[PDB]
Amino acid sequence: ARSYAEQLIDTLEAQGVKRIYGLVGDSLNPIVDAVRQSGIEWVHVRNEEAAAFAAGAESLITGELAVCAASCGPGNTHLIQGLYDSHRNGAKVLAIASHIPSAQIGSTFFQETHPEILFKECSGYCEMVNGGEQGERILHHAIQSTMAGKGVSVVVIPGDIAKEDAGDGTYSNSTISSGTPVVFPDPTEAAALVEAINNAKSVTLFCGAGVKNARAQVLELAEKIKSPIGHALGGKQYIQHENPFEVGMSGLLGYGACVDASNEADLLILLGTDFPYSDFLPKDNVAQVDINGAHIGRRTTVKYPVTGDVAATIENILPHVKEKTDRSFLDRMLKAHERKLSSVVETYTHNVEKHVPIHPEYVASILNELADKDAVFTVDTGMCNVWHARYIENPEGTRDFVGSFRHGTMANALPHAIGAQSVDRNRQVIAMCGDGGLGMLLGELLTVKLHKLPLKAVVFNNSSLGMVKLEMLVEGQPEFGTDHEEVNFADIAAAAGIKSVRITDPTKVREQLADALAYPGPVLIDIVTDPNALSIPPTITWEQVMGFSKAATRTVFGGGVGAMIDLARSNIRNIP
C-alpha cells in the first residue's frame, strides 16, 4: 500500500471483494493498474450504467459488498441509473467515482462535474477525497455505511490524489461491522399489538421483503391465529412457496383473495412491507411491524405501530397471543382464493397456447417449468413484471430474483444478470428481457460475449413498450408512440458472437426453449410475442394506473396465473 490507489485496492481485496465492474479511463487509470496487480478481477462493461446495475445485482445475490468504478465527469455520470436502483434495493455497493484533477476543480475544466453533489439522492454516504490519509478514512466510512444497511456509498476521487501516498493504515486496519442486530420491539408497542390480535376475531398477515428471515415465525403465528397470508411483490419469493395460508398478492399486478382477505379481516398486520398502493389497503384497524420506524404508517392508517424485526417481534408476542380455534375466515378466504384463480385461468388463458403471435403468459408458464430449481431470474421493468409475478414460482425457496421493483427502471434485466452470473458461472441465470429494455442497453450483449457469461436472455419481443400500451388503453388515449417496426434480436445476438434462437411458432416454444436453457454458454432466445395480450377491466382509471387514486379498490389487471393454482387447490383439500 504505497499510493492511495494501491491502498484502496488492497483494502477492498482484504475485505473479500472479487471483482470490480467498470470502464477504464483518465483518473481511474492508477486504480485499474492496482487492480491488474491484485487478485481482484476487472470486469469491463460497454456502458458504466451496466457496471452499477451489475454491482447491485451481485450484492443482492451474495449479501456482501460489490464495487463499480468509473472515470471522471461523463464516466461516473453514467453510473447514476444503476446507483438509484441499487440504492432503492438496499444493495451493499461502493461506487468509485473518479474525478477531474483537484487543481482544476472550480475552473469549468474539460469534463468537470460535481459528483459529490449529484449522487446525494442515490446514496447513504457520498464524499470527496482531498488527500491520501483523508481518502483512507472516507473509504472506511463509505464501506462501513453501506455494510450497515444505509444504501449506496460513493467515494469521489480526483485522479491526481489517487497517485499520492496512502494513509498510515489506521482506518483500513479496522474490522467492518457487517452483522445483523436482533431488533426486539418496545414492550409497550408489543403489548398493544397482542391486545389488537386477541381482540380481533379474524386477522390477515400481509408480508413484504422484511419477512426474508422470518418464514418460520410468520407461519407459526398464522397457524396460531388462523390468518390468511398475502404478500407485496417484494415478499413473493419468501412467503408464497409451501404456505398453507397463501392468499396471493395485492396491487394492479395482484392475484387471488389477498385484497379481500386484507380488507375483510378485523385486523390487518403489515409485516416487513412498504407496499405503496394505498387504495388496495384498509384504514380501519391496521398494525405495522417495520425495522425502520420512519417507514411506519407511510402507506395507510396504522393504529398499532411496532418498530422491530419481524422474527423477533413474532417470537416476543407469541406466548401472549391466544390460540384462535375458529378457522371460518381462513377457510372462507382459502376457498375464495382458489375460485378467483380458477376463474382467471378460465377467463383469460383457455386454449391460448396456439394463438399467433405467441402469448407471453404461455411463454412464462413454460419458462417456470423448464428453469432450474435454483435459477436466478432477473426481470426487466414493464410487462415482464406481470409475467414474473403471476407465473414464476419459487418452489423450495432456492431461486433468486433481481428486479427494479422500487426504482422501476427499464433495461435492468441484462446488466442485473451480468452481475448475478459473475458470482457463480455454474448457476443458471435467466434474464426476462423486454424488447424496449434490451434495445435501451443493447451494447451489453458485447459484455456477455467478452466475459463468456452463460446467462440465458429470454426476450419477450412484442415490438412494443407493452406496459405503456396498457396505460393508454386504461386512459382511453389512442395508441401512439408505443409500437414500432420489428427488430430481430436473434440475428443481432448472432452478429455479436452469441448463440441465438428465434421462436415465432407457439407449438415450438417448449422444445426450442428447452434446447436453449440446456446450452452450455450464453444464449439469446428471441420470442415473438403478442403486444395485445392484455385484458383491462373498464373500471380501471388513469389515476389508478399512475398510483394517485384515493378510492378503495379491489380491481387487478386481467390475464391468467400459472402454477400457483396447484398450492391454492392443495390448501383447499387440506382444510380439516
Ligand X SMILES: Cc1cc2nc3c(=O)[nH]c(=O)nc-3n(C[C@H](O)[C@H](O)[C@H](O)COP(=O)(O)OP(=O)(O)OC[C@H]3O[C@@H](n4cnc5c(N)ncnc54)[C@H](O)[C@@H]3O)c2cc1C
User: Judged by CB under 8 A, does residue 23 bind a copy of itself?
Assistant: yes
User: Judged by CB under 8 A, does residue 302 bind a copy of itself?
Assistant: yes
CA-CA distance, 447 to 419, in Å (whole number)?
A: 11
Q: Cβ atoms within 10 A of the Cβ of 96, count?
A: 29
Helix 132-147 vs helix 4-14: crossing angle, to nearest 10: 30
In the list 15, 38, 42, 369, the residue contacting a copy of itself (rule: CB under 8 A) is 42
CA distances from 303 to 208, 271, 331 (A): 19, 14, 27
Beta strands in 488-545 (DSSP E): 499-503, 523-528
User: Judged by CB under 8 A, does residue 558 bind a copy of itself?
Assistant: no
CB of 532 to Mg ion, least distance (A): 12
Q: Is 26 annotated as a binding residue?
A: no
User: Which element (helix H / strand E) includes 432?
Assistant: strand 429-434
CA-CA distance, 401 to 412, in Å (whole number)?
A: 12
DSSP, residue by residue, 456-477: EEEEEE-SB-HHHHHHHHHHTP
Q: Which of 125/277 has CB closer to ligand TPP?
A: 277
34 three-class SS? helix
User: Judged by CB under 5 A, does residue 204 bind Mg ion?
Assistant: no
Q: Is 309 annotated as a binding residue?
A: yes
Single-letter amino acid code for the residue at 86: S
CB of 435 to Mg ion, least distance (A): 4
Given Mg ion, ligand X, a copy of itself, none, residue 496, with its beta carbon under 5 to 8 Å by kind, binds a copy of itself
Given Mg ion, a copy of itself, ligand X, none, residue 335, with its beta carbon under 5 to 8 Å by kind, binds none
Candidates 7-15, 102-110, 344-352, 363-371; binding stretch for a copy of itself (CB under 8 A) = 102-110
Given Mg ion, ligand X, a copy of itself, none, residue 454, with its beta carbon under 5 to 8 Å by kind, binds none
407 three-class SS? coil
125 three-class SS? strand
CA distances from 423 to 54, 238, 242, 414, 419 (A): 10, 21, 28, 15, 7
Q: What is the CA radius of gyration of the chain?
A: 25
Q: Is 234 annotated as a binding residue?
A: yes
Q: Which of 110/294 has CB closer to ligand TPP?
A: 110
Given ligand TPP, a copy of itself, Mg ion, none, residue 283, with its beta carbon under 5 to 8 Å by kind, binds a copy of itself
Contact 317, 224 (CB under 8 A): no
Q: Is 405 annotated as a binding residue?
A: yes
Residues that bind ligand X (CB under 6 A): 110, 208-210, 232-235, 249-254, 272-276, 289-292, 295, 309-310, 381, 385, 404-406, 408
Site string for a copy of itself, 461-500 (x = CB under 8 A): ----x-xx--xx--x-xx-xxx-xx-xx--xx-xxx----
Nearest CA among 296, 355, 350, 334 for reference residue 504: 355
User: Judged by CB under 8 A, does residue 141 bind a copy of itself?
Assistant: yes
Candidates 199-207, 405-413, 458-466, 496-504; binding stretch for Mg ion (CB under 5 A) = 458-466
**Strands 153-158 and 125-128, bridge-based pairing:** parallel
Q: Is 466 annotated as a binding residue?
A: yes
Q: Which of 22/185 has CB closer to ligand TPP?
A: 22
Q: Which of 51/376 has CB closer to a copy of itself?
A: 51
| Lookup result for grid cell 491502498 | 7
Q: Which of 151/506 has CB closer to a copy of itself?
A: 151
CA-CA distance, 11 to 28, in Å (whole number)?
A: 17
Contact 43, 423 (CB under 8 A): no
CB of 176 to ligand X, least distance (A): 16
Binding residues for FAD, by number, are 209, 233-234, 250, 252-253, 273-274, 277, 290, 295, 309-310, 405-406
List residues binding Mg ion (CB under 5 A). 434-436, 462, 464, 466
